[PDB]
Structure 1
Amino acid sequence: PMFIVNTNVPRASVPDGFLSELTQQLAQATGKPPQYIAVHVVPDQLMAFGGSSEPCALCSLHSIGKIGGAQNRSYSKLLCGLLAERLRISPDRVYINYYDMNAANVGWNNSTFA
């Protein structure tokens, strides 16, 4: 699976180990090995949430399955929790879009996962 966070929080506010923590936490939450988790953190962004430039984050979690009503609620609590604790971003200034990818539509290593 793939997790991306775009935030207006400065690069210096992202703690050392944040990518490793996201990797480990997402591996645990999705039930998939850390070797298949990619994480991408994009600080210093020009963004606004509800017209306000207070700390916010726009995120996506893409996975082949393990996406659904209850799972996404659990992912949102986990990820908002981490963004609040590590980046000091309020959960109500975070969006996370969830994408259930078909294996045929994820490329990797010269082929796809189909």
Structure 2
Amino acid sequence: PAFIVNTNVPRASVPEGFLSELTQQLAQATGKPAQYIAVHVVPDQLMTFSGTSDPCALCSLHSIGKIGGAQNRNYSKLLCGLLSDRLHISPDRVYINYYDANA
């Protein structure tokens, strides 16, 4: 699958090893080997979310299958927590859309 993150936090607030960590995390969460994963992080964006430009993140995960409700819940929790902790965004400001990359 492919995980895209669009964020208004500065490029310098992104830790060394963040793309590697996130990559390993998705590999754990999805049960897919790192070989089937792509991560794309885009910092320094001009964005408003729920009315303000406080730190936020619009993300999307694209898979070649339909994710189930339990997976959605488990992915969002894991992914929002990772993003809020490492990039310091309030959990309620990280939004994730799931797309059936082949549907």
- TM-score scaled to structure 1, two decimals? 0.87
1:91 matched to which residue of 2?
91
Distance in structure 1 (CA, Å) of the matches to 2:66 and 2:30: 6
1:65-84 alignment, distance < 5 Å:
65=65, 67-84=67-84
Alpha-carbon distance, 1:51 to partner:
1.2
* Structure 1 unpaired stretches of 5+: 106-114
Corresponding residue of 2:58: 58
> Which of structures 1 and 2 has the larger relative contact order (alpha carbons within 8 angstroms, sep 6+)?
2
RMSD between superposed Cα atoms in Å:
1.1
Pair 1:46 & 2:46 matched:
yes
Given residue 92 of structure 1, which amino acid in structure 2 is its aligned partner?
A: D
2: CA distance, partners of 1:12 / 1:74:
29
> How far off its partner does 1:64 sit?
1.3
Q: Which has the larger radius of gyration?
A: 1
Q: Aligned partners of 2:59, 2:91: CA distance in 1, in Å?
A: 12
- After the TM superposition, which of the residue ranges 46-55 and 63-72 deviates more from structure 2? 63-72
Gapped regions of structure 2 (runs ≥ 5) = none
* Matched length: 103
Are the structure 2 counterparts of residues 60 and 43 from structure 1 closer, same or farther at C-alpha, using a change threshold of 3 Å? same
Structure 2: how far apart are the matches of 1:4 and 1:22?
A: 11
Residue number in structure 1 paired with 2:10: 10
Give percent identity, aligned residues only.
87
Counterpart CA distance in 2 for 1:101 and 1:38 is 13
